[PDB]
Design a binder for this molecule. Sequence first.
Ligand SMILES: *[C@@H]1O[C@H](CO)[C@@H](O[C@@H]2O[C@H](CO)[C@@H](O[C@@H]3O[C@H](CO[C@H]4O[C@H](CO)[C@@H](O)[C@H](O)[C@@H]4O)[C@@H](O)[C@H](O[C@H]4O[C@H](CO)[C@@H](O)[C@H](O)[C@@H]4O)[C@@H]3O)[C@H](O)[C@H]2NC(C)=O)[C@H](O)[C@H]1NC(C)=O
Ligand SMILES: *[C@@H]1O[C@H](CO)[C@@H](O[C@@H]2O[C@H](CO)[C@@H](O[C@@H]3O[C@H](CO[C@H]4O[C@H](CO)[C@@H](O)[C@H](O)[C@@H]4O)[C@@H](O)[C@H](O[C@H]4O[C@H](CO)[C@@H](O)[C@H](O)[C@@H]4O)[C@@H]3O)[C@H](O)[C@H]2NC(C)=O)[C@H](O)[C@H]1NC(C)=O
Ligand SMILES: *[C@@H]1O[C@H](CO)[C@@H](O[C@@H]2O[C@H](CO)[C@@H](O[C@@H]3O[C@H](CO[C@H]4O[C@H](CO)[C@@H](O)[C@H](O)[C@@H]4O)[C@@H](O)[C@H](O[C@H]4O[C@H](CO)[C@@H](O)[C@H](O)[C@@H]4O)[C@@H]3O)[C@H](O)[C@H]2NC(C)=O)[C@H](O)[C@H]1NC(C)=O
Ligand SMILES: *[C@@H]1O[C@H](CO[C@@H]2O[C@@H](C)[C@@H](O)[C@@H](O)[C@@H]2O)[C@@H](O[C@@H]2O[C@H](CO)[C@@H](O[C@@H]3O[C@H](CO)[C@@H](O)[C@H](O)[C@@H]3O)[C@H](O)[C@H]2NC(C)=O)[C@H](O)[C@H]1NC(C)=O
Ligand SMILES: *[C@@H]1O[C@H](CO[C@@H]2O[C@@H](C)[C@@H](O)[C@@H](O)[C@@H]2O)[C@@H](O[C@@H]2O[C@H](CO)[C@@H](O[C@@H]3O[C@H](CO)[C@@H](O)[C@H](O)[C@@H]3O)[C@H](O)[C@H]2NC(C)=O)[C@H](O)[C@H]1NC(C)=O
Ligand SMILES: *[C@@H]1O[C@H](CO[C@@H]2O[C@@H](C)[C@@H](O)[C@@H](O)[C@@H]2O)[C@@H](O[C@@H]2O[C@H](CO)[C@@H](O[C@@H]3O[C@H](CO)[C@@H](O)[C@H](O)[C@@H]3O)[C@H](O)[C@H]2NC(C)=O)[C@H](O)[C@H]1NC(C)=O
Ligand SMILES: *[C@@H]1O[C@H](CO)[C@@H](O[C@@H]2O[C@H](CO)[C@@H](O[C@@H]3O[C@H](CO)[C@@H](O)[C@H](O)[C@@H]3O)[C@H](O)[C@H]2NC(C)=O)[C@H](O)[C@H]1NC(C)=O
Ligand SMILES: *[C@@H]1O[C@H](CO)[C@@H](O[C@@H]2O[C@H](CO)[C@@H](O)[C@H](O)[C@H]2NC(C)=O)[C@H](O)[C@H]1NC(C)=O
Ligand SMILES: *[C@@H]1O[C@H](CO)[C@@H](O[C@@H]2O[C@H](CO)[C@@H](O)[C@H](O)[C@H]2NC(C)=O)[C@H](O)[C@H]1NC(C)=O
Ligand SMILES: *[C@@H]1O[C@H](CO)[C@@H](O[C@@H]2O[C@H](CO)[C@@H](O)[C@H](O)[C@H]2NC(C)=O)[C@H](O)[C@H]1NC(C)=O
Ligand SMILES: CCCCCCCCO[C@@H]1O[C@H](CO)[C@@H](O)[C@H](O)[C@H]1O
Ligand SMILES: CCCCCCCCO[C@@H]1O[C@H](CO)[C@@H](O)[C@H](O)[C@H]1O
Ligand SMILES: CCCCCCCCO[C@@H]1O[C@H](CO)[C@@H](O)[C@H](O)[C@H]1O
Ligand SMILES: *[C@@H]1O[C@H](CO)[C@@H](O)[C@H](O)[C@H]1NC(C)=O
Ligand SMILES: *[C@@H]1O[C@H](CO)[C@@H](O)[C@H](O)[C@H]1NC(C)=O
Ligand SMILES: *[C@@H]1O[C@H](CO)[C@@H](O)[C@H](O)[C@H]1NC(C)=O
Lengths: 494, 494, 494
Amino acid sequence: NSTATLCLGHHAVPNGTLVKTITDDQIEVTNATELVQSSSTGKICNNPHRILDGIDCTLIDALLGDPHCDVFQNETWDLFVERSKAFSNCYPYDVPDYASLRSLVASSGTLEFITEGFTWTGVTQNGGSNACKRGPGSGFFSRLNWLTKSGSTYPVLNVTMPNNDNFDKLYIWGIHHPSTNQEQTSLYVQASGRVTVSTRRSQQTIIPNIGSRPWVRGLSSRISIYWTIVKPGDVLVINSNGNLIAPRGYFKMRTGKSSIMRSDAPIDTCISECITPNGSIPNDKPFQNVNKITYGACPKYVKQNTLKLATGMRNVPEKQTRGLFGAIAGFIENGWEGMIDGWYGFRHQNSEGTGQAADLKSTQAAIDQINGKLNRVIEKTNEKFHQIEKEFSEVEGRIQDLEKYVEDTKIDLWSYNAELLVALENQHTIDLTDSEMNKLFEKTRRQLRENAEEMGNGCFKIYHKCDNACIESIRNGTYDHDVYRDEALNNRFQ
Amino acid sequence: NSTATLCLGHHAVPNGTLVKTITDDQIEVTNATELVQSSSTGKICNNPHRILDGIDCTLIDALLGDPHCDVFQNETWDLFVERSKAFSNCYPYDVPDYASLRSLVASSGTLEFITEGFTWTGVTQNGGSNACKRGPGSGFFSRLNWLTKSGSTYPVLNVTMPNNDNFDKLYIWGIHHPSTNQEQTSLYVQASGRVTVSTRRSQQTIIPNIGSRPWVRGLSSRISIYWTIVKPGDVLVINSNGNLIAPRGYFKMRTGKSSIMRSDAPIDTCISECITPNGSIPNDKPFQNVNKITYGACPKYVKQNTLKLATGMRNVPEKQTRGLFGAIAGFIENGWEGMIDGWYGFRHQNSEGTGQAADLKSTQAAIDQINGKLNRVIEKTNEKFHQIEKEFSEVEGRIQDLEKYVEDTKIDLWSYNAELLVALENQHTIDLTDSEMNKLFEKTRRQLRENAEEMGNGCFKIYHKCDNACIESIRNGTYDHDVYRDEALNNRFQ
Amino acid sequence: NSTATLCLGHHAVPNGTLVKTITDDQIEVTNATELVQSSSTGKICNNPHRILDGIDCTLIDALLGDPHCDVFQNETWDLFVERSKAFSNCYPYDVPDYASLRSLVASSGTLEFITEGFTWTGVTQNGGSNACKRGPGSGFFSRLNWLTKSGSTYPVLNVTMPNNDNFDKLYIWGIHHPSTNQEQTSLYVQASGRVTVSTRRSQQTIIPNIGSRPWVRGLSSRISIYWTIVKPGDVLVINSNGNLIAPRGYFKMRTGKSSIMRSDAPIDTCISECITPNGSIPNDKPFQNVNKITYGACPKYVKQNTLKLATGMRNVPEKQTRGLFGAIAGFIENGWEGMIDGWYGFRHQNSEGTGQAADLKSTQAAIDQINGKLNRVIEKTNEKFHQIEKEFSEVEGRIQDLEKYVEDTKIDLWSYNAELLVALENQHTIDLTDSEMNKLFEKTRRQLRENAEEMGNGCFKIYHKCDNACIESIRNGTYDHDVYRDEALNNRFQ
Ligand SMILES: *[C@@H]1O[C@H](CO)[C@@H](O[C@@H]2O[C@H](CO)[C@@H](O[C@@H]3O[C@H](CO[C@H]4O[C@H](CO)[C@@H](O)[C@H](O)[C@@H]4O)[C@@H](O)[C@H](O[C@H]4O[C@H](CO)[C@@H](O)[C@H](O)[C@@H]4O)[C@@H]3O)[C@H](O)[C@H]2NC(C)=O)[C@H](O)[C@H]1NC(C)=O
Ligand SMILES: *[C@@H]1O[C@H](CO)[C@@H](O[C@@H]2O[C@H](CO)[C@@H](O[C@@H]3O[C@H](CO[C@H]4O[C@H](CO)[C@@H](O)[C@H](O)[C@@H]4O)[C@@H](O)[C@H](O[C@H]4O[C@H](CO)[C@@H](O)[C@H](O)[C@@H]4O)[C@@H]3O)[C@H](O)[C@H]2NC(C)=O)[C@H](O)[C@H]1NC(C)=O
Ligand SMILES: *[C@@H]1O[C@H](CO)[C@@H](O[C@@H]2O[C@H](CO)[C@@H](O[C@@H]3O[C@H](CO[C@H]4O[C@H](CO)[C@@H](O)[C@H](O)[C@@H]4O)[C@@H](O)[C@H](O[C@H]4O[C@H](CO)[C@@H](O)[C@H](O)[C@@H]4O)[C@@H]3O)[C@H](O)[C@H]2NC(C)=O)[C@H](O)[C@H]1NC(C)=O
Ligand SMILES: *[C@@H]1O[C@H](CO[C@@H]2O[C@@H](C)[C@@H](O)[C@@H](O)[C@@H]2O)[C@@H](O[C@@H]2O[C@H](CO)[C@@H](O[C@@H]3O[C@H](CO)[C@@H](O)[C@H](O)[C@@H]3O)[C@H](O)[C@H]2NC(C)=O)[C@H](O)[C@H]1NC(C)=O
Ligand SMILES: *[C@@H]1O[C@H](CO[C@@H]2O[C@@H](C)[C@@H](O)[C@@H](O)[C@@H]2O)[C@@H](O[C@@H]2O[C@H](CO)[C@@H](O[C@@H]3O[C@H](CO)[C@@H](O)[C@H](O)[C@@H]3O)[C@H](O)[C@H]2NC(C)=O)[C@H](O)[C@H]1NC(C)=O
Ligand SMILES: *[C@@H]1O[C@H](CO[C@@H]2O[C@@H](C)[C@@H](O)[C@@H](O)[C@@H]2O)[C@@H](O[C@@H]2O[C@H](CO)[C@@H](O[C@@H]3O[C@H](CO)[C@@H](O)[C@H](O)[C@@H]3O)[C@H](O)[C@H]2NC(C)=O)[C@H](O)[C@H]1NC(C)=O
Ligand SMILES: *[C@@H]1O[C@H](CO)[C@@H](O[C@@H]2O[C@H](CO)[C@@H](O[C@@H]3O[C@H](CO)[C@@H](O)[C@H](O)[C@@H]3O)[C@H](O)[C@H]2NC(C)=O)[C@H](O)[C@H]1NC(C)=O
Ligand SMILES: *[C@@H]1O[C@H](CO)[C@@H](O[C@@H]2O[C@H](CO)[C@@H](O)[C@H](O)[C@H]2NC(C)=O)[C@H](O)[C@H]1NC(C)=O
Ligand SMILES: *[C@@H]1O[C@H](CO)[C@@H](O[C@@H]2O[C@H](CO)[C@@H](O)[C@H](O)[C@H]2NC(C)=O)[C@H](O)[C@H]1NC(C)=O
Ligand SMILES: *[C@@H]1O[C@H](CO)[C@@H](O[C@@H]2O[C@H](CO)[C@@H](O)[C@H](O)[C@H]2NC(C)=O)[C@H](O)[C@H]1NC(C)=O
Ligand SMILES: CCCCCCCCO[C@@H]1O[C@H](CO)[C@@H](O)[C@H](O)[C@H]1O
Ligand SMILES: CCCCCCCCO[C@@H]1O[C@H](CO)[C@@H](O)[C@H](O)[C@H]1O
Ligand SMILES: CCCCCCCCO[C@@H]1O[C@H](CO)[C@@H](O)[C@H](O)[C@H]1O
Ligand SMILES: *[C@@H]1O[C@H](CO)[C@@H](O)[C@H](O)[C@H]1NC(C)=O
Ligand SMILES: *[C@@H]1O[C@H](CO)[C@@H](O)[C@H](O)[C@H]1NC(C)=O
Ligand SMILES: *[C@@H]1O[C@H](CO)[C@@H](O)[C@H](O)[C@H]1NC(C)=O
């Protein structure tokens, strides 16, 4: 024989995954990764963020100093975890703007308490109740001072405390709401109380409300909790004529990365940066689908459960529809399921035999750009610490509707971003792999000047006698057309 | 003659629309669709959502039971429609946090009222006024009970009602603000009222304010409306010493898809899923430009009035600049305005005659991907029910500024998304149609191995004698080069 | 010699900038622009928006009429600028919902004040204090009237004022909080005050709070400021029995483009549309990185400091690795650093000599589309006037957390948009420049039918005798293959 066949092609596999592109909803690739984390271990990892498990304590009971919460004094945290089995076992109380105080104390990240010398004059301190039993005796919140009439008098109280330090000081105080007109007089000589608490720049005044409420732990009376922040250089004044739950000291305040989360997952020993209420998740993927609530370095929440990024080429599973020869057939036809060493490669039919090989230059380069794509996409800063509430237990009206509207707007815009990026990138991936294929072909055609012709099967009918060494030279990039030119021209045109 | 001409091309039209792509602000396509709905019928369609037209009633007058609003008792709705001609004809009143109560009742979607056995003891019930005439006699809101002194006394009222059911119970109540110190004593024996209303977990106390206001319907006094929600397992207590507008029962509460809209459009019999204040619009297109306020499955609001998606190729209107022969001219030159059967096609000049035909394989495939594009783009879930207010009649300050800022941020981000998607998709459309053209050419060149040559007009000078059957074979995909090879080689090279 | 060489190529430069594309994080282009403005002059330009510098005055002291703020009466502005050295030198005061009133007055844009005939009857007007010295004498806010007991009486005050005009009227009023029970009686005969201020549709009632506060400028008493808006057709009533700081007139209200900014930059004579707290910036670029707070037509704020848009092609710096001949080498190899006239061009080796030239058709067109890209990208409407606060000095809790969350969400979504647009556009730029190159090549190959062959260096071995005129004809687009066909065919194939 006086002629040779040389064909080009790309690897195929037996089993493929389907991806979403621009034009079409399904297409079959050789390999594809997942970009959405769907699963959790179900436990909270204790490194590298410092976790503080509240057990039967809320953060507002720990601060006030409820008796079953005395483990928590001078504690610090990055994340505080509240449990759904938590309860209260002291005087019954309410906090106007509860939500604001809870958010302020959680971002501070400490319960550091400094006792101060306050001089209450002409009154009896350390009032108590059997709604709050610390041991067999009656008790009260550890950080507040119930004041009551001494003898037959409650004098107008007037005290001042100045900030001369270089940090901010948070004072918690309150007021008692008695259930009758006969209890008010019994505790405080007057008939109507008043509590005024002021700085140089602000003031608040509260009056007490009298009347009957549902029984909780044997009482139809309640306490109302308030707060004031005093800056460096400013003064505090307190001026009450009755019903004052006085402060005992101040709390230090920091700006940092601390927050709070309501969860029911157990705590465990392991290392994880992202925490959700369903336990810790890994942060290798760019998106997540576990929970919209998060803490620390985390993937973005989206609505989808699956987004597949193509890491391979298109998969034309082979025509075992073949000839007697299974005449070597190239890329224009189908893929090659018998190639393992590399993606792009050459099959040669010669007098010597049939053969096969792979190509490093091309296979390397494709792999390079696809790996690039992967790196821009998979990994980046989304490191976030304190945020709005995204779950509610009551109906409130206006503010809560705006908080729900803000969160849904964010989710639909990030979900649209995630859908388009995958479709764009998947199209570009198919295109770059197919151009790479056609680049090897033109390189081959350019080397075989007039000593070869194209058939249109993906194949080059060479009109001279090519041996294994000659095929190897073409494959190599050293084929010297001049040597066989005269023979090939006389063979092809005559 | 011993030779033939075969040219390739694509269809042109006489009149075209202009589209926006990546690079340029205008370009001329063969056909293009609209993606923004600009128009409305001006009527509200009554299926498939249940519409309740308020006529001269607001939703807050229907709930309280104003006399001209007694048609509305035990009503239900998906959407409630308020009219701008609506007024009030009862006792003059104000609701602190009016906006919150209106939003809460609208999302519930019912006015189901259950009368309860409340025991008011030592007082006269069913107080009345000629500001609210139900028939010739004086009257009052149907769902509230005005209580007044019996003989020369108003006892301290103390009542309780427990929730033992498995649903939430909404109580509406209020307080009277008399205009003098002489009217307060006349209605209630005391000089100053007080109203306390509490659960196990919450409390509210209101005091009445006395003084003179503008006359409305013959009165300088007003009523203030309040509300409490009681959960399954909890209790309600009410404790007033004067000025109490007592409740008569509770309202049931649901979670569902109900809302409210201020409109002035008439109601009609037809089927439409999306409702706006300018009437119902169809939901075939992805974007909308009619109104930012919506209900149900709807397109997204954007700022643009027009966005055109190219559904065709580029339009090179023909060179009637021609030869004596109008020598058949291909795609490299211009488009063909004389082709009707299909997009891509062949024109042959032969000894037998001039001719023309179209190509199904190509025309089909292009049409296929363009139709795909259309489907990803035009249709999807945007199904939304209760949202924030987006129009305001008064100035309020902070909250309203944040609500306006949230809405404008959303609009500019969705408008940028709509501008880029059209430009991206339009570029891809032009590219896919032009590659499809060049694909048919290479297929043709590959079949005509050495028996044809390229001229560069988009045309193939075939150096053998081609008849109609031969042209048909090329067009077909069965052309056998071997038959005419010797003749063509001797004709072209010698 | 009987043959010729003709090669094609594109311009290279010595020094290049690196851009970010889809696949890769760095690549070297010939030229690139900046899209993020990083710098400011540090001054506020006084045209074309009307700037009003407050010097030691806040906007809330200018409105009340503090003595060191009497320059500001009947002023108007587009932007009001407050300075950090500003202070207060009158009666000490607080405004509940301070933030709301400041935002309302800033968007109005005027301090136009109309004195009205209010008849205060049985009281002494124009009360004074040495905390507010206007000259040697005692003084008070210019726009408020302190009223006090006449003889031994303060009658119940009852006044009305109707709006019969066609615009909205803003009344500012207040209430005095005395420090003792002995001062209250001294100023107002009664023991407890009350102030009720109402329209047909709204009402507010305030009570005064008595007790001791920190000393500011020799006083332990304070004033509380309130406000009411009265619409066209409505009435105002005022009904106080004590402690009323009465209004003297109303302020007109407009809807317009006015706002306020806290800055410390000096004012200068120049023209600039965008103002930031760090001074005016130019608005030629689409993004900005100077400050998130802005006024007027401005670029969008993003987190990045640099985004480079490729305005040129890729830069293969030349192989000075060469031959003895430096045989002319084309684009497949490297770029040409010796070409100045244009981007794409031709180098010819002939018997006559070596030579070089450039190509207008191609160079023009590339430049055209790149300039197009630039125009869509760089310039558009972002013209915005009044917005939310984005910096806070105190901790407040809930509302402030939602305002901070809304702003960060907006920034991360606009930063992601800015990163993808640059990467998309940069890829498209590289692609359009490289296709333009390959378009000139095919045009050249198409003209040289069988009288030339391709070598694969980017070069055309022409197998006939080409002189300068012949090379010029090819370059020109008038090369007539027929003339040299026989000679070339006999030279190449035999
Ligand atoms: C205004 O109106 C309100 C509402 O009615 C009144 O509030 C009620 O006040 C009474 C008297 O204090 C309360 O009665 C008490 O209820 C307690 C809770 O009951 C639970 O526990 C018992 C015991 O297991 C169960 O039997 C019962 O089903 C509940 O599960 C009881 O513990 C109290 O018992 C006390 O008295 C008995 C006497 O036999 C002793 O054995 C006990 O040890 C204990 O000392 C008592 O029965 C009632 O609960 C209140 N109602 C609510 C819902 O709060 C106001 O009193 C009223 N005020 C005025 C001024 O009129
Ligand atoms: C504190 O200050 C306030 C504000 O001034 C006082 O409020 C005013 O009180 C008077 C007395 O109640 C009100 O006068 C009444 O106005 C009604 C509305 O007027 C409209 O309708 C009439 C009739 O069509 C028109 O003529 C008029 O132009 C208006 O369009 C009148 O209807 C009332 O008429 C009554 O008396 C006449 C007597 O001739 C009878 O014919 C009528 O049938 C009817 O009985 C009356 O004139 C006045 O409107 C109040 N002002 C406002 C704006 O509310 C407080 O009284 C004052 N309080 C104290 C304690 O000092
Ligand atoms: C309830 O409790 C509060 C808090 O203690 C009391 O408020 C104090 O009241 C007193 C008396 O008014 C105030 O004392 C005054 O302080 C002024 C400010 O002091 C600064 O300036 C002086 C002078 O430069 C400095 O020496 C000092 O270090 C501060 O920088 C003084 O200016 C006042 O001086 C007056 O008296 C002196 C007498 O020698 C004269 O020379 C002066 O000219 C002037 O007339 C005075 O000393 C004190 O500041 C208040 N404390 C605060 C922080 O406000 C309430 O009085 C109390 N109320 C009741 C009912 O008990
Ligand atoms: C809770 O924290 C307070 C405050 O202490 C601070 O926080 C701790 C966790 C540590 O980090 C401390 O380093 C930090 O200051 C503790 O208050 C401390 O109480 C002791 C005992 O009363 C104080 O010692 C005093 O020392 C002075 C002399 O300098 C004597 O005059 C006193 O009589 C007394 O002995 C100590 O100064 C004080 N720390 C303060 C105010 O800075 C508190 O004990 C701690 N409680 C628990 C349960 O850990
Ligand atoms: C408005 O709705 C209330 C509540 O009824 C509920 O809503 C209705 C629209 C229907 O869907 C009802 O199926 C649903 O329960 C109506 O209250 C109803 O009033 C009647 C008459 O008083 C009650 O009948 C009573 O039946 C008991 C015996 O079971 C007798 O002891 C009573 O004397 C009385 O005859 C009925 O139970 C009650 N429904 C309740 C509380 O569930 C109300 O009539 C209705 N009004 C209008 C204008 O439609
Ligand atoms: C501040 O502005 C008020 C209101 O005037 C309005 O704003 C000004 C800046 C100008 O633009 C005015 O054109 C505009 O109306 C000034 O009030 C004005 O005061 C004068 C003097 O009292 C009033 O003149 C009166 O004229 C009538 C006859 O028409 C006489 O009966 C009066 O006795 C008196 O002479 C003038 O009408 C009034 N403008 C009003 C109410 O519209 C105010 O003077 C001005 N102050 C400063 C510091 O500029
Ligand atoms: C325009 O002016 C603004 C301020 O009005 C400049 O922003 C400020 O930039 C400095 C330097 O980055 C910041 O200081 C740093 O703050 C951090 C956090 O507290 C601290 O850890 C550092 O040690 C340092 O003090 C300052 O906070 C920042 N202000 C804000 C609110 O961001 C801005 O850089 C100026 N821009 C131009 C173009 O001049
Ligand atoms: C298809 O892509 C997946 C990507 O998950 C490849 O899976 C990796 O396989 C290697 C084998 O050594 C593991 O070490 C990795 O942990 C796997 N996952 C990741 C994160 O890369 C898989 O090998 C690819 N298959 C083919 C046939 O190429
Ligand atoms: C150009 O595109 C428009 C798209 O609106 C085509 O209009 C449709 O024409 C058919 C004709 O049978 C109607 O049944 C449809 O209702 C039309 N609208 C839609 C929604 O598709 C139009 O036919 C196209 N023209 C050409 C020449 O292709
Ligand atoms: C590279 O691009 C920059 C863009 O900044 C060009 O810089 C411009 O140069 C002209 C020279 O006449 C100036 O008038 C402009 O003000 C410059 N800036 C702008 C805003 O265009 C620069 O000329 C380009 N360089 C090359 C080699 O093409
Ligand atoms: C190349 C075409 C890009 C298609 C962009 C997506 C258009 C509609 O895409 C939709 O986005 C939703 C998020 O809002 C996702 O939940 C849906 O899965 C998706 O269908
Ligand atoms: C391929 C280039 C993409 C251009 C993206 C749009 C850049 C500016 O585009 C602008 O977006 C505005 C919405 O904010 C629209 O109102 C304007 O019509 C549009 O010009
Ligand atoms: C073609 C690939 C597009 C990459 C899109 C950007 C994916 C992550 O991109 C990140 O966006 C951040 C804004 O949130 C920027 O601050 C970071 O610089 C950028 O790395
Ligand atoms: C082929 O190229 C290699 C380098 O990759 C070279 O060592 C070898 O001599 C070349 N010739 C053959 C084996 O084709
Ligand atoms: C062309 O192809 C058709 C099938 O599409 C076949 O039936 C016919 O015989 C073929 N030959 C001709 C008419 O060219
Ligand atoms: C080349 O083209 C120009 C027009 O651009 C023409 O004037 C000239 O005669 C042509 N022939 C030559 C110089 O190649």
